[PDB]
Amino acid sequence: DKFDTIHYVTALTKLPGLVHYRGADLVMRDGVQWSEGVKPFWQKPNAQPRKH
RNA sequence: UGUGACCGUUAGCGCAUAGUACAGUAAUGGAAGUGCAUAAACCAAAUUAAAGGCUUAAAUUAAAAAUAAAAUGGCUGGUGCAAUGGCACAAAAAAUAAGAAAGUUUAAA
Ligand SMILES: [Mg+2]
Ligand SMILES: [Mg+2]
Protein backbone atom coordinates (compact mmCIF):
# COMPACT_ATOMS: atom_id res chain seq x y z
CA ASP A 1 0.00 0.00 0.00
CA LYS A 2 2.99 2.36 0.42
CA PHE A 3 3.60 2.58 -3.33
CA ASP A 4 3.47 5.48 -5.79
CA THR A 5 3.92 5.88 -9.54
CA ILE A 6 7.71 6.11 -9.19
CA HIS A 7 7.85 2.92 -7.12
CA TYR A 8 5.97 0.89 -9.75
CA VAL A 9 8.15 2.22 -12.57
CA THR A 10 11.39 1.48 -10.71
CA ALA A 11 10.38 -2.10 -9.91
CA LEU A 12 9.52 -2.83 -13.55
CA THR A 13 12.73 -1.33 -14.93
CA LYS A 14 14.92 -3.37 -12.56
CA LEU A 15 13.13 -6.69 -13.06
CA PRO A 16 14.94 -7.52 -16.35
CA GLY A 17 18.30 -7.30 -14.57
CA LEU A 18 17.21 -9.69 -11.82
CA VAL A 19 16.49 -12.44 -14.38
CA HIS A 20 19.77 -14.26 -14.98
CA TYR A 21 20.84 -16.45 -17.88
CA ARG A 22 21.91 -20.07 -17.51
CA GLY A 23 25.50 -20.67 -16.51
CA ALA A 24 25.76 -23.17 -19.37
CA ASP A 25 24.92 -20.45 -21.92
CA LEU A 26 27.69 -18.08 -20.76
CA VAL A 27 31.45 -18.22 -21.35
CA MET A 28 33.78 -16.35 -19.01
CA ARG A 29 36.54 -14.14 -20.38
CA ASP A 30 40.06 -14.40 -18.96
CA GLY A 31 40.57 -11.64 -16.41
CA VAL A 32 37.95 -9.22 -17.75
CA GLN A 33 36.12 -7.19 -15.10
CA TRP A 34 32.89 -5.21 -15.22
CA SER A 35 33.40 -1.79 -16.79
CA GLU A 36 31.71 0.75 -19.06
CA GLY A 37 30.31 -1.32 -21.90
CA VAL A 38 32.42 -4.41 -21.11
CA LYS A 39 31.24 -7.57 -19.35
CA PRO A 40 33.33 -10.49 -18.03
CA PHE A 41 31.59 -12.96 -20.38
CA TRP A 42 30.03 -13.37 -23.81
CA GLN A 43 26.69 -15.01 -24.53
CA LYS A 44 26.08 -18.02 -26.73
CA PRO A 45 23.35 -17.61 -29.37
CA ASN A 46 19.77 -17.79 -28.10
CA ALA A 47 20.66 -17.90 -24.41
CA GLN A 48 17.98 -19.25 -22.06
CA PRO A 49 17.03 -17.98 -18.58
CA ARG A 50 17.49 -19.98 -15.41
CA LYS A 51 14.95 -22.75 -14.93
CA HIS A 52 13.80 -21.71 -11.45
C1' U B 1 21.71 -42.40 -15.03
C1' G B 2 26.87 -44.73 -15.03
C1' U B 3 31.15 -47.60 -12.79
C1' G B 4 33.51 -50.83 -8.29
C1' A B 5 40.02 -56.67 -6.44
C1' C B 6 33.13 -51.46 -1.83
C1' C B 7 29.41 -54.44 2.31
C1' G B 8 25.99 -58.88 2.21
C1' U B 9 21.14 -58.83 8.32
C1' U B 10 26.48 -58.32 15.10
C1' A B 11 28.31 -56.31 7.88
C1' G B 12 26.60 -51.83 4.97
C1' C B 13 23.04 -45.70 6.66
C1' G B 14 20.52 -45.21 13.28
C1' C B 15 16.67 -47.81 9.76
C1' A B 16 16.54 -54.79 3.98
C1' U B 17 12.47 -48.29 6.91
C1' A B 18 12.13 -46.13 12.03
C1' G B 19 13.90 -41.38 13.79
C1' U B 20 9.08 -45.81 14.97
C1' A B 21 8.74 -48.67 20.03
C1' C B 22 10.78 -47.16 24.39
C1' A B 23 13.73 -43.62 28.46
C1' G B 24 13.05 -38.28 29.97
C1' U B 25 9.01 -32.56 32.69
C1' A B 26 11.72 -30.75 28.50
C1' A B 27 15.82 -29.88 24.93
C1' U B 28 17.57 -34.70 23.78
C1' G B 29 18.93 -39.74 23.48
C1' G B 30 17.54 -44.01 20.62
C1' A B 31 16.77 -50.03 19.53
C1' A B 32 15.41 -55.16 18.06
C1' G B 33 13.53 -57.16 13.59
C1' U B 34 14.95 -61.07 5.87
C1' G B 35 14.23 -66.38 3.48
C1' C B 36 15.82 -71.95 3.80
C1' A B 37 18.63 -76.09 6.22
C1' U B 38 20.96 -82.84 11.68
C1' A B 39 26.27 -76.17 14.52
C1' A B 40 28.03 -75.21 20.00
C1' A B 41 27.19 -74.56 25.29
C1' C B 42 23.02 -76.58 27.85
C1' C B 43 19.00 -80.62 30.68
C1' A B 44 16.92 -86.06 30.76
C1' A B 45 17.64 -91.16 28.96
C1' A B 46 21.29 -95.02 27.41
C1' U B 47 26.22 -100.03 32.45
C1' U B 48 27.31 -105.32 31.73
C1' A B 49 26.77 -110.03 27.36
C1' A B 50 26.00 -116.21 27.43
C1' A B 51 25.95 -121.08 23.43
C1' G B 52 30.35 -127.73 21.98
C1' G B 53 28.90 -134.18 17.17
C1' C B 54 22.87 -135.91 11.40
C1' U B 55 25.01 -141.21 8.04
C1' U B 56 27.85 -136.99 2.34
C1' A B 57 29.62 -139.47 -5.43
C1' A B 58 26.49 -136.65 -10.19
C1' A B 59 23.13 -129.60 -7.87
C1' U B 60 21.92 -124.43 -9.67
C1' U B 61 22.27 -120.72 -13.26
C1' A B 62 16.70 -116.32 -20.43
C1' A B 63 19.25 -111.80 -18.94
C1' A B 64 19.36 -108.32 -15.31
C1' A B 65 17.89 -106.33 -10.46
C1' A B 66 17.33 -107.06 -5.10
C1' U B 67 20.32 -108.69 2.54
C1' A B 68 25.49 -104.72 6.51
C1' A B 69 23.95 -98.33 12.07
C1' A B 70 29.41 -93.04 10.29
C1' A B 71 24.02 -89.26 12.95
C1' U B 72 18.87 -90.11 20.32
C1' G B 73 14.89 -86.52 21.85
C1' G B 74 15.02 -81.37 22.54
C1' C B 75 16.05 -75.90 23.13
C1' U B 76 18.77 -72.35 20.44
C1' G B 77 19.87 -69.73 15.46
C1' G B 78 25.90 -69.87 14.31
C1' U B 79 27.65 -71.21 9.53
C1' G B 80 26.71 -71.75 4.05
C1' C B 81 23.82 -69.50 -0.35
C1' A B 82 20.77 -65.32 -2.57
C1' A B 83 19.15 -60.02 -2.76
C1' U B 84 13.21 -55.48 -4.01
C1' G B 85 18.93 -52.66 1.26
C1' G B 86 23.28 -49.53 1.93
C1' C B 87 28.55 -46.99 0.78
C1' A B 88 32.00 -43.99 -2.66
C1' C B 89 32.64 -40.97 -6.43
C1' A B 90 31.78 -40.03 -11.89
C1' A B 91 28.44 -38.02 -16.18
C1' A B 92 24.24 -34.74 -17.13
C1' A B 93 21.27 -31.05 -15.03
C1' A B 94 20.34 -27.53 -11.23
C1' A B 95 22.00 -23.58 -7.82
C1' U B 96 25.34 -19.29 -7.60
C1' A B 97 28.31 -13.81 -8.98
C1' A B 98 28.12 -8.94 -10.81
C1' G B 99 30.53 -2.08 -12.32
C1' A B 100 26.37 1.40 -11.74
C1' A B 101 21.60 2.90 -8.64
C1' A B 102 14.55 5.54 -10.60
C1' G B 103 18.83 5.32 -17.21
C1' U B 104 21.01 2.95 -22.25
C1' U B 105 26.07 -2.87 -22.89
C1' U B 106 25.96 -9.08 -24.94
C1' A B 107 22.14 -8.86 -30.83
C1' A B 108 24.42 -15.06 -34.96
C1' A B 109 21.78 -14.95 -39.89
MG1 LIG C 1 22.36 -65.00 8.76
MG1 LIG D 1 22.21 -53.10 10.98
Phi-psi region of A11 (alpha: psi -120 to 50; beta: other; left: phi over 0): alpha
CA distance A52 to A50: 6
| Structure resolution, Å | 3.1
Would you tell me how many other CB atoms lie within 10 Å of the CB of residue A26? 15
The full DSSP string for A27-40 is EE-SS---BTTB-S
Angstrom distance, A19 CA to B21 C1' = 51
Q: CA A52, C1' B83: Å apart?
A: 40
Chain B positions within 7 A of any protein Cβ atom are 93-103, 105-108
- State how far the Cα of A46 lies from the Cα of A16, in Å rounded to an integer: 16
Determine the Cα–Cα distance for residues A3 and A46; give it in Å rounded to an integer. Answer: 36
